[PDB]
Amino acid sequence: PDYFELRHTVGFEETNLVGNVYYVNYLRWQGRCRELFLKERAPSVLAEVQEDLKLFTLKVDCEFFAEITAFDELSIRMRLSELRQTQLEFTFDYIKLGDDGGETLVARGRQRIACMRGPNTATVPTLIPEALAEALAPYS
Amino acid sequence: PDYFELRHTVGFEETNLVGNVYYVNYLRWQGRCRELFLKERAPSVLAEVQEDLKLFTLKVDCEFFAEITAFDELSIRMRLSELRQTQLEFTFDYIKLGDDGGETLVARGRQRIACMRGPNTATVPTLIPEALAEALAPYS
Amino acid sequence: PDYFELRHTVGFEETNLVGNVYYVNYLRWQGRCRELFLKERAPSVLAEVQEDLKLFTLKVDCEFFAEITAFDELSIRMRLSELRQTQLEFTFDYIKLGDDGGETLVARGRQRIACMRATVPTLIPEALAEALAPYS
Amino acid sequence: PDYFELRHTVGFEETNLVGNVYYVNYLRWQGRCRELFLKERAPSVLAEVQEDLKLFTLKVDCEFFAEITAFDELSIRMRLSELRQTQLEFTFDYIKLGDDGGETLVARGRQRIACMRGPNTATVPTLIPEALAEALAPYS
């Protein structure tokens, strides 16, 4: 499809007092989708982050359209929004998989990431790694 | 004076493998500061949450200007940026407190909230509770 | 396999400052293993536990033997250690899968749950017991 | 008094859809109480662990006797149950603070920590740091 998919059933312990989901959990789901992409599409990046490659998070946000609860089936879909020189922006479509087959959008979020180089103290900008740029081809 | 403050030292477990802090943690702290203000300044609101009053987070965001490591002293400053009759927006300044007295803005977050009442099906908005609006006066 | 398996790869953000895994994450993985088991093996329980039934955790624990870091492949095996009329105990084996195919007992934990349904000490749901028959 | 206290109000987002508290949340609290202790009473330990010193958690557990919900006032009390030459055991008593001054033992958890030195494969038991042994003095 146009997106990278992360299937996730809403945990019983991922809800609040009034049955709704803690807004932080949505963002945890973003990281779980972003990291899963790097494990299956660009493992080359993963090893570089353990070295001197640092994927700085510039901005992350999320808007909530509908309230979800426990045991609701979700399809967190990631799409490449912007592709720049040393930066890139993702987009996360939180969709609820209804039993009938409906696909409603319960939330949407995006994440701005910059690529840097060198030690944590003295850093420098760097191009988006080739493997990562190629893996983001059908997901724009 | 201009803000409500949450004191926080960056945890040893809140720091990852390379010395960076997961952005999710910023939003966890942002959530704590939102409840500390309530439980202190407007405790009456919390009694209403268990009843009919519902607090809907419409949108959250956070921008990052610099990286931090464990044992960094943070001053999470919460101030009211936007005030409406049914909604409000909280701004969160993440001030990295220096040992010499310096103050470096390391991050900034925003949180749009909507005051709701009623059942799970038919939610209706409500005027911002008197005590909640009262406690927001010196933080405008 | 006499156990229920949950495959998990240690997240880059699940590690701490010195490159080790926060112990809280270990029990975080226990919940996901218990949840996943209930989902596939006894879906009737989940439909029962949300309105009246309550699976109350009496005791959780976890002892650690070795240390693991990011991207370490883990095979979390769950099995029924003790079965009773109102209570049941799970046991979780934390096995680090070597790059060649070797296996290492990194950690091991237990969870003690009492069935309740403001609550009433109730029988273990028959559907839950039948799904546990292999993993006894 | 005879323990290290961490006051904590049960969060609205820490409680699930049935009114109970996730058992994982209990352990983050005692881990927070542990880190806050090392932060306040023995900061030297927090710097040595970044080198060759290791605070290896041998075993951790927690027993639950009651049910708590949102906005409950808790008093987490950390004591020293056992101290060896290289090992130590903490005991966490979760005390629910009532409005009428009543106190109730809600839960109890413990944690065994082994002090070791050197790289992961060359790990060897080491004596408790003098800063830590001095910090555990008012628990004798």
CA distance C131 to chain B (A): 34
- Considering only CA atoms, which of B46, B65, A1, B137 is closest in space to residue D72? B46
Euclidean distance between CA atoms C34 and C49, whole angstroms? 13
CA distance C130 to chain D (A): 26
Whole-Å CA distances, C3 to B39, C6, C35, C57, C94 = 46, 10, 15, 21, 12
Tell me what percent of chain A is helix, strand and coil, each rounded to the nearest 5: 25, 40, 35
Euclidean distance between CA atoms A22 and C76, whole angstroms? 27
CA distance D112 to chain A (A): 27
Contact A15 D19 (CB under 8 A): no
| D121 three-class SS | coil
Chain C residues touching residue B9 (CB < 8 angstroms): none
Cβ distance C27 to C60 under 8 Å? yes
C9 touches chain A (CB under 8 A): yes
Whole-Å CA distances, D133 to D42, D44, D140 = 9, 11, 11
A16 touches chain D (CB under 8 A): yes
Q: Which residues does residue A88 pair with via DSSP β-bridges, in sequence order?
A: A83, A113
DSSP annotation of A36 reads H
Relative orientation angle of helices C23-41 and D23-41, to the nearest 10 degrees: 180
Q: Which helix (H) or strand (E) holds D134?
A: helix D130-135
Residue with tokens 């963002």: A27
Chains that touch C (3 or more CB pairs under 8 A): A, B, D
- Listing DSSP states for chain B in one string gives --SEEEEEEPPSSSB-TTS-B-HHHHHHHHHHHHHHHHHHH-HHHHHHHTTT-EEEEEEEEEEESS---TT-EEEEEEEEEEE-SSEEEEEEEEEEE-SSS-EEEEEEEEEEEEEEES-SSS-EE-PPPHHHHHTTGGG-
Q: Considering only alpha carbons, which residue of chain D is nearest residue B45?
A: D71
Phi and psi dihedrals of D18, rounded to 5? Answer: -115, -5
Task: Select from B13, B16, B19 the Cβ nearest to the Cβ of C12.
Answer: B16
| D47 three-class SS | helix
Euclidean distance between CA atoms C58 and D75, whole angstroms? 20
Contact A16 D15 (CB under 8 A): yes
Resolution in A, one decimal?
A: 2.8
Euclidean distance between CA atoms C78 and C108, whole angstroms? 10
Contact A19 D17 (CB under 8 A): yes
Chains that touch B (3 or more CB pairs under 8 A): A, C, D
Euclidean distance between CA atoms B124 and B113, whole angstroms? 14
Euclidean distance between CA atoms D92 and D110, whole angstroms? 6
| A35 three-class SS | helix
Euclidean distance between CA atoms C84 and C124, whole angstroms? 8
Euclidean distance between CA atoms C3 and A39, whole angstroms? 27
Chain center to CA of D115: 16
Cβ atoms within 10 Å, residue C121? 12
CA dihedral A22, A23, A26, A30 (to 10 degrees): -130
Chain B residues touching residue C24 (CB < 8 angstroms): 13
Domains in chain D with CATH codes: 1-140 (3.10.129.10)
- Considering only CA atoms, which of B45, B8, B3 is closest in space to residue B26? B8
Task: Select from D12, D22, D24 the Cβ nearest to the Cβ of A17.
Answer: D12
Contact A59 B59 (CB under 8 A): no
What are the tokens at A11? 């945990």
Contact C32 A11 (CB under 8 A): yes
Q: Considering only alpha carbons, which residue of chain C is nearest residue B18?
A: C17
Q: Taking chain A, what is the end-to-end CA distance rounded to the nearest angstrom? A: 10
